[PDB]
Amino acid sequence: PVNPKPFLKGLVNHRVGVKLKFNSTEYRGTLVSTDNYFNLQLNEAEEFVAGVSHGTLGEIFIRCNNVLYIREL
Amino acid sequence: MKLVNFLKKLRNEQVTIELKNGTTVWGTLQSVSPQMNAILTDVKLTLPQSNGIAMASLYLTGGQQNIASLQYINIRGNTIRQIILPDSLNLDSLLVDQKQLNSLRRS
Amino acid sequence: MNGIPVKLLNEAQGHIVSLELTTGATYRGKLVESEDSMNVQLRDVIATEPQGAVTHMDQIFVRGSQIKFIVVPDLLKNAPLFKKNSSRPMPPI
Amino acid sequence: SKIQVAHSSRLANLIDYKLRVLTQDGRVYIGQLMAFDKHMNLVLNECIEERVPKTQLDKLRPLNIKVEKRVLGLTILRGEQILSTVVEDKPLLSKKERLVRDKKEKKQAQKQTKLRKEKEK
Amino acid sequence: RPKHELSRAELEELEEFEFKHGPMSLINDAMVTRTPVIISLRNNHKIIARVKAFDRHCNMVLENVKELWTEKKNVINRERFISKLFLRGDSVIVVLKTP
Amino acid sequence: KAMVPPINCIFNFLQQQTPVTIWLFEQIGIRIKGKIVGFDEFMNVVIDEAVEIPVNKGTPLGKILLKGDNITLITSA
Amino acid sequence: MSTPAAEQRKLVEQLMGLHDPKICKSYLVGECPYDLFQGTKQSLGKCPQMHLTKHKIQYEREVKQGKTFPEFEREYLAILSRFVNECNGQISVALQNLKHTAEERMKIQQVTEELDVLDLISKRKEVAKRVRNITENVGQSAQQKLQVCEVCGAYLSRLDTDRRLADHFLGKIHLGYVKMREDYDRLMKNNR
Amino acid sequence: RYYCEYCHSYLTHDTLSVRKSHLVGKNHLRITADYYRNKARDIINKHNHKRRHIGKRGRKERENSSQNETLKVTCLSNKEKRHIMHVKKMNQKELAQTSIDTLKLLYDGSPGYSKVFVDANRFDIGDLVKASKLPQRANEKSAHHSFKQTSRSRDETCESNPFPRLNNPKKLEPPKILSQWSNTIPKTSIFYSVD
Amino acid sequence: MNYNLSKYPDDVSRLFKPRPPLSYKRPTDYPYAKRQTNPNITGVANLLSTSLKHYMEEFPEGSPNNHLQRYEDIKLSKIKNAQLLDRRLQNPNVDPHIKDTDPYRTIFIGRLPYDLDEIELQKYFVKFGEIEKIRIVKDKITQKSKGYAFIVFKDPISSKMAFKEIGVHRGIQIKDRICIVDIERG
Amino acid sequence: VSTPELKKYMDKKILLNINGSRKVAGILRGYDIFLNVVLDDAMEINGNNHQLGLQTVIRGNSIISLEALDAI
RNA sequence: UGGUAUGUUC
RNA sequence: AUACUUACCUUAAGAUAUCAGAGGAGAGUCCUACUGAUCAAACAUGCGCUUCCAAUAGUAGAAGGACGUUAAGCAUUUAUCAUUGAACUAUAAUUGUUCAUUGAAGUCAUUGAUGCAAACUCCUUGGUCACACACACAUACGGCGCGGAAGGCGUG
């Protein structure tokens, strides 16, 4: 019924979370823009190493090479 | 807007290349493919402080007698991690991007 | 387009070749039918796992990206693909 | 190894040289290239594959090193799991002899085209 | 829209439009305001440097590179100052821009 | 019977809305359980009601756009 | 395409009421004749109506349990009847060409000249002349030795062995036309 | 587009169904087999001799070698050396093509002859024999041979042919000898053999 | 090794006796179950806290980009040239040379010769209808013939027929050139 | 570009290997130009047994080779 | 506007 | 070899080095046997240039190997789990000890594998070249013979 491109254009301006492949880097922030190669741009992101935080980051560009999934809270 | 054409303007430049295996390669550039398959001459390569696969790749190239001195090495694109240019070269004149200037003039 | 090595791999069809995989398992058998994407099919396959043991498959089909190399027989040392100045007898219109 | 590899040569000029090509594992293949492509898939004549064992690696870490050599003959190696290639040994016949051989191949190819034109008539 | 059926020789204009108004807004802001960015790489080589050029493969030219990694045996931090660098987009995990 | 291509296999798997077990990469990766709602040509599969269980205490995850390069295997639980 | 990712994108874009003229009813029921003759020498060109896989899956799910539509079946029956009439006209033209080749002017003149000289001892001479005329007729028929295929209307041979004939029967034209004949016979058995 | 380097024939846009059918047809088989045979014959027949290195020999070697003896050189005419080298080439090719086939005809009445030596009921390579029959799509290739097939099935047991001497066997072949050294055979046998 | 599926004869197969099987030894790399990059990569928030304060203190100012400045100067020069072209093109009722009669009988002949005269143009225009006025347009900065003229005839139908006869036969052959005629397009 | 020649594996039991040990034995129902494999009645084999649902689809990136368990 | 391969007759 | 039938297919595009100026064609584009500069290729050509080219006034030796021998050389390390029975150390899916029934795969290799070290033998390569068996050198060595192999630089 749905496709990842209308779901991902509608995912803009939401507190989303992105897990990486390494199980020690998870970035949770507000999505700004996303291209057709699915590169991610976030704002006021937070680092999550194995669940626990380390500090706020801000405007950040997450490459689609190292993403595993993106979630909606 | 591929920056391999920036490296095509870097002939006879005495650079270093850190590979993804971990090897630092000091040598002069001769040519580079558009797929970034770069050939180098007057080369010495060194694995710093380990990775036993990188030590095997360092020794099994002939000319070891851990700085290995080799005459001519071609390097594949996906094994290049980063390349360090000499600081005496001016980046403001080599990055003029004449193909991008012609594409902007064609618009 | 295709290139010389994929034409050489398509040349030695129906011959005893030996593959090595990326994991370390070495296969050896008769090539059934090679493709341009190097997804090659072998028959009477003898296999050596990276653990060391030796087994025998009847009909294997390996994907081209998980191949380290493949050994063709030596009589393909002299091939017309290796000729540099072979002219072309009047291609059709 | 005092070979003095050419200073401005590429893969079209390095053909029929006894290469010593390195891979990601370090499984070094020694042999003559006879063809390549865009993905750098190299055929290797009289090729040998050499490695070092895990016990020899401790001695290699800072002398003699006992490498393990297997014989592959004429193989065809892919360009994905390779890292670097160098020129180890020069071929048998020289540049002038290869030039005379290439002129003989061109004259033989022109004679073959004249024979095809004679058979077409 | 499919990529092969857009047009011929006008894909560079769409690539520049995606550069100005897409995920490339941070690499564009760093090269015009000369702010230092922190690129974390796939082998713990964190780079603090200024961006000089942009590429489709995210091949980035960096000037006044201060790179830092951590050796875990025991725990030491080793840094290096490199004047000019051409970084491949394969190694890049993430790019952070400071305000 | 006939041939069932993988795109139509995932399309029928989408229509039936069976319970889904999606595997991933090795020991770092974590097996996910959910229900498929969307996919594309690069196999970026969108799943809902996701509970993750590591390789041999599951936690809810919500709605997930799982990318293609880590997807290994899809089963109907 | 040169890349397979564009091929997969094309498959997604062509895979993702229902009584509309845009949907090919012969493909919605199944085995469209414009699909079974796509790239062969007997090609009809291109189907003007669009083909879809999601509509075919919905029609299969409806015909599994829900219901059936007789209008698309009647349209497919009319299309199969028109194509079978065109193929029967082509087979009749091939049979007329074979009958004209068997009844050529010089061949009938040679047969009449052989039969004019065909007329105990006289009965044995007439039997030998009839055997010679049969040998001449067999030599005249062996110059082509082309039969007529009873189903697909192509040309066959009697002296040809069964392996080349089995290679002939496994084509796109013959499989498609046998499937169309099976569908036409099923619809004529259901209607009558 | 596709070009066969062997048959020197072109093709349309590169279809796998056409290229697969091209390597099965008989003309490509003949040209490919003849080309491989001629290239193997050329790389065997190429006498790549070593480049000679003649040095100024020692004095005492010259006083020793020029006083011992002078040997005689034998040499033949053109047709003689041509006929001898042609006989040597046919002998080399008939030795390269031959093989010892004594175990196949020596265990012919064995109870497991139909399970190993028949080469069609073999387990590991019998599917390769049963797969490519060369199905003879020409009627003349099937109508040419009019002899029996004598296909021995696997299900032949020990009940069939119980006594191997009543069912008429063949006397085994004698050990073949070299025809150039056939004049030194003992002309007198040990025992009297009849017929 | 003894019996083959191969379509080649036995004389080819004796030449195709393959290499002996490869002598297997123990591998050196990690297996593909263990092939991965490094885990537990820490976050970049520690560099923005302590290392950024030492990094900004050593280089408070960045290097200027001469290539980006040259590209921006080229874009600004192109924008200024486009603005000057728009101001020159945006700024037929405020022209004294175009103060003739209505354009229904006023045709325009363009790409004419630079050394032509008004008498030959009037003789060419009066062949297919009576001409009321003729005016050759020139540049204001220099007194050179640009090759354009406007001829207003007495009737619109005769002027339209003259323009069709002059533009249908690949341009009217005016004595050194082929000048086509069309509407004034006012 | 080219469709892989898996026509001989149409109604036969195959055994995929996944990345060094995950041996999924199933019945090949369909494939693509990406070597994505559709298996009916899958079964995980470990050196123990584990069932993998009725139907499954397996990504061609993790697929290395496949053994034809059934005779052709 | 064509190509590749195969089977009959002269 | 001609004549005919059948099976499959009938094509991703654009271009051929770069920069500056002048002229022509109705801000943008094209052309110049148009002009200057850079670069690439080919053919010649020279730089007291760089490296190598094996005794014969002997029965040798340089480079690369043996997938050759002594050599089964010398020194080390392993050669399956579970249930139960007669005793049992015992936190285990009785692990440890002696014997056995049964259950799933079950590398061959222990004359095996790794490390160490010497000797002998045999293969492919060369200028196995022209004169002579000679007293030079702090500006360390008259590189001022005929060539060949590899390479650098410069000119047309």
Q: Retrieve residue F21's tokens.
A: 């077990």
Give me the phi and psi of C2, to 5 degrees please. Answer: -80, -60
Write the CA distances from H107 to H47, H98, H159, H170, integer angstroms. Answer: 43, 20, 17, 12
Asked if I44 contacts A62 with a C-beta cutoff of 8 angstroms, the reply is no
Cα–Cα dist I174/H83, whole Å: 93
- Shortest alpha-carbon distance between residue E17 and chain G (Å): 22
Q: What is the CA radius of gyration of chain E?
A: 16
Residue whose C-alpha is closest to residue D21's, from D41, D6, D1, D37: D41
Residues 49-68 of H, Cβ under 7 A from nucleic strand L: 50-51, 53-61
**CB atoms inside a 10 Å sphere around CB F73:** 24
Chains contacting E with at least 3 CB pairs below 8 Å? Answer: A, B, G, I
Q: Is H21 exposed, middle or buried (0-12, 13-18, 19+ CB in 10 A)?
A: exposed
Cα–Cα dist D47/D32, whole Å: 7
- Shortest alpha-carbon distance between residue G3 and chain J (Å): 7
Q: What residue in J sits closest to F11 (Cα-Cα)?
A: J57
Q: CB of C41 within 8 Å of any CB in chain I?
A: no
Q: Which nucleotides of K are covered by protein (CB under 7 A)?
A: 1-9
Q: Which domains does chain F have, with CATH numbers?
A: 3-76 (2.30.30.100)
B88/L51 CA-to-C1' distance in Å: 33
**Using the beta-carbon criterion (under 8 Å), do C63 and J35 form an inter-chain contact?**
yes
What 3-state DSSP class applies to C11?
A: helix
Asked if E95 contacts E47 with a C-beta cutoff of 8 angstroms, the reply is no
- Shortest alpha-carbon distance between residue A42 and chain E (Å): 9
Residue whose C-alpha is closest to residue E87's, from D115, E72, E53: E53
DSSP H80-138: HHHHHHHHHHHHHHHHHH----HHHHHSTT-TTTTTTTTSSS-SSSHHHHHH------S
Q: Retrieve residue I13's tokens.
A: 């197969």
Q: What residue in I sits closest to D56 (Cα-Cα)?
A: I28
Cα–Cα dist H111/H132, whole Å: 28
Cα–Cα dist C20/C48, whole Å: 9
What 3-state DSSP class applies to E2?
A: coil
Q: Retrieve residue D111's tokens.
A: 């004679």
Which DSSP category does A2 fall into?
A: B
Select the residue from D13, D27, D50, D86 to test the B interface by mutation, using most B Cβ atoms within 10 A. Answer: D86
Do E and A make contact, counting contact as 3+ CB pairs within 8 angstroms?
yes
Resolution (A): 4.1
Contacts of G98 (CB under 8 A, 6+ apart): G146, G148
Give the nucleotide with minimal C1' distance to the Cα of D53: L114
Residue whose C-alpha is closest to residue E16's, from D78, B1, F69: B1
Q: What residue in C sits closest to J60 (Cα-Cα)?
A: C63
Q: Retrieve residue E68's tokens.
A: 């830092």
Q: Which residues of I touch F28 (CB under 8 A)?
A: 36, 39
Cα–Cα dist E86/B86, whole Å: 11
For E62, the enclosing helix (H) or strand (E) is strand E60-72
Residues 54-93 of C, Cβ under 7 A from nucleic strand K: 92-93
Q: Which nucleotides of L are covered by protein (CB under 7 A)?
A: 4-14, 18-19, 26-29, 40-41, 43, 50-52, 54-59, 65-67, 105-108, 114-117, 124-130, 148-153
Give the nucleotide with minimal C1' distance to the Cα of H7: K4
Asked if I171 contacts I124 with a C-beta cutoff of 8 angstroms, the reply is no
Q: Retrieve residue G188's tokens.
A: 């004529």
Helices of type H across chain B: 4-8, 52-59, 91-94, 98-106
Q: CB of G162 within 8 Å of any CB in chain H?
A: no
**Using the beta-carbon criterion (under 8 Å), do J29 and F76 form an inter-chain contact?**
no
Write the CA distances from E85 to B97, E94, I69, integer angstroms. Answer: 18, 17, 21
D110/L64 CA-to-C1' distance in Å: 40
Asked if D42 contacts D19 with a C-beta cutoff of 8 angstroms, the reply is yes
Q: Which residues of I touch A57 (CB under 8 A)?
A: 43-45, 48
**Using the beta-carbon criterion (under 8 Å), do I25 and D27 form an inter-chain contact?**
no
* CATH number for position E24: 2.30.30.100
Q: What pairs with residue E85 in β-bridges?
A: E62
What 3-state DSSP class applies to I62?
A: coil
Select the residue from I16, I17, I24, I28 to test the D interface by mutation, using most D Cβ atoms within 10 A. Answer: I28
Side-chain half-sphere exposure of C29, counting CA atoms within 13 A: 26
The experimental method is: cryo-EM
The domain containing residue E38 runs over which residues? Answer: 1-99
Q: Retrieve residue H48's tokens.
A: 């790549």
Question: Strands I177-179, I172-174: parallel, antiparallel or unpaired by DSSP?
Answer: antiparallel
Q: Can you say whether the dihedral through the CA atoms of G75, G80, G83, G88 is positive or negative? A: negative
Apex CA I38: angle with CA I34 and CA I44, to 5°? 160
DSSP J1-58: -PPP--GGGSSSEEEEEETTTEEEEEEEEE--TT--EEEEEEEEE----EE--SEEEE
Q: Retrieve residue F23's tokens.
A: 């595997």
Domain total of chain C: 1
Contacts of D4 (CB under 8 A, 6+ apart): B71
Give me the phi and psi of I46, to 5 degrees please. Answer: -75, -25
Q: Which residue has the tokens 């090729």?
A: D47
Cα–Cα dist F40/I167, whole Å: 58
Cα–Cα dist A29/A42, whole Å: 6
Asked if C58 contacts C44 with a C-beta cutoff of 8 angstroms, the reply is yes
Q: Which domains does chain B have, with CATH numbers?
A: 1-97 (2.30.30.100)
Q: Retrieve residue F57's tokens.
A: 């205490």
Please report whether residue C91 resides in a domain: no
* CATH number for position C27: 2.30.30.100
Cα–Cα dist E83/B88, whole Å: 10
**Using the beta-carbon criterion (under 8 Å), do A64 and F67 form an inter-chain contact?**
yes
Cα–Cα dist H87/E79, whole Å: 80
What 3-state DSSP class applies to H32?
A: helix
Q: What pairs with residue E96 in β-bridges?
A: A60, E38
Q: Which residues of C touch H20 (CB under 8 A)?
A: 33
Chains contacting B with at least 3 CB pairs below 8 Å? Answer: D, E, I
Q: Which domains does chain J have, with CATH numbers?
A: 1-71 (2.30.30.100)
Cα–Cα dist I153/I101, whole Å: 9
Contacts of G76 (CB under 8 A, 6+ apart): G25, G26, G29, G183, G187
Fold for the domain defined by A1-72: SH3 type barrels. (2.30.30)
Query: Does nucleic acid strand K have an atom less than 7 angstroms from the CB of G138?
Result: no
Q: Retrieve residue G119's tokens.
A: 């007329």
Give the nucleotide with minimal C1' distance to the Cα of H17: L8
SS3 content of chain H, % helix, strand, coil (to 5): 40, 0, 60
Q: What does the H/E/C string look like for A9-72?
A: HCCCCCEEEEEECCCCCEEEEEEEEECCCCCEEEEEEEEEECCEEEEEEEEEEECCCCEEEEEE
Cα–Cα dist I179/I125, whole Å: 12
For D99, the enclosing helix (H) or strand (E) is helix D95-120
**Using the beta-carbon criterion (under 8 Å), do A65 and E94 form an inter-chain contact?**
no
Side-chain half-sphere exposure of H120, counting CA atoms within 13 A: 13
Q: CB of I17 within 8 Å of any CB in chain H?
A: no
**Using the beta-carbon criterion (under 8 Å), do I67 and B101 form an inter-chain contact?**
no
* CATH number for position D79: 2.30.30.100
Q: What residue in A sits closest to F70 (Cα-Cα)?
A: A68
Q: CB of I50 within 8 Å of any CB in chain D?
A: no
Query: Nucleotide L6: nearest residue by CA–C1'?
Result: G168
Write the CA distances from B1 to B5, G162, H28, integer angstroms. Answer: 8, 63, 48
Q: Retrieve residue G169's tokens.
A: 């029967």
Cα–Cα dist D10/D22, whole Å: 17
Q: Give the distance, in angstroms, between the CA of residue C28 and the centroid of all CA atoms in the same chain.
A: 11
Asked if I131 contacts I154 with a C-beta cutoff of 8 angstroms, the reply is yes
The domain containing residue D53 runs over which residues? Answer: 11-87
Q: Retrieve residue A57's tokens.
A: 């980051």
Q: What does the H/E/C string look like for chain G?
A: CCCHHHHHHHHHHHHCCCCCCCECHHHHHCCCCCCCCCCCCCCCCCCCCECCHHHHHHHHHHHHHHCCCHHHHHHHHHHHHHHHHHHHHHHHHHHHHHHHHHCCHHHHHHHHHHHHCCCCHHHHHHHHHHHHHHHHHHHHHCCCCCEECCCCCCEECCCCCHHHHHHHHCCHHHHHHHHHHHHHHHHHHHHC
Cα–Cα dist I167/I172, whole Å: 7
Residue whose C-alpha is closest to residue J27's, from J44, J3, J9: J9
Which DSSP category does D62 fall into?
A: -
Q: How many residues does chain I have?
A: 186
| Dihedral angle of Cα D105, D110, D115, D117, to the nearest 10 degrees | 150
Hey, what amino acid is at C1? Answer: M
**CB atoms inside a 10 Å sphere around CB G29:** 21
Hey, what amino acid is at G71? Answer: E
Query: Does nucleic acid strand K have an atom less than 7 angstroms from the CB of H137?
Result: yes
Q: Exposure string (b/e) for I156-171, b if CB count within 10 Å is 16 or more? A: bebbbebbeebbeeeb
Give me the phi and psi of E53, to 5 degrees please. Answer: -150, 160
Cα–Cα dist I125/I129, whole Å: 7
Roughly what angle, to the nearest 10 degrees, separates helices F6-16 and G53-61?
50
Asked if A14 contacts A72 with a C-beta cutoff of 8 angstroms, the reply is yes
* N- to C-terminal Cα separation, chain C: 19
Q: Which residues of A touch I52 (CB under 8 A)?
A: none
Please report whether residue C9 resides in a domain: yes
Cα–Cα dist D12/D34, whole Å: 10
Residue whose C-alpha is closest to residue A31's, from A50, A18, A48, A47: A18
Side-chain half-sphere exposure of H4, counting CA atoms within 13 A: 20
Please report whether residue C31 resides in a domain: yes
Interface of E with B in 79-98 (CB under 8 A): 82-88, 90-91
Nearest to B60 among D52, D79, D87 (CB): D52
B48/L47 CA-to-C1' distance in Å: 42
Write the CA distances from H48 to B87, D46, H43, H45, H51, integer angstroms. Answer: 56, 18, 10, 9, 9
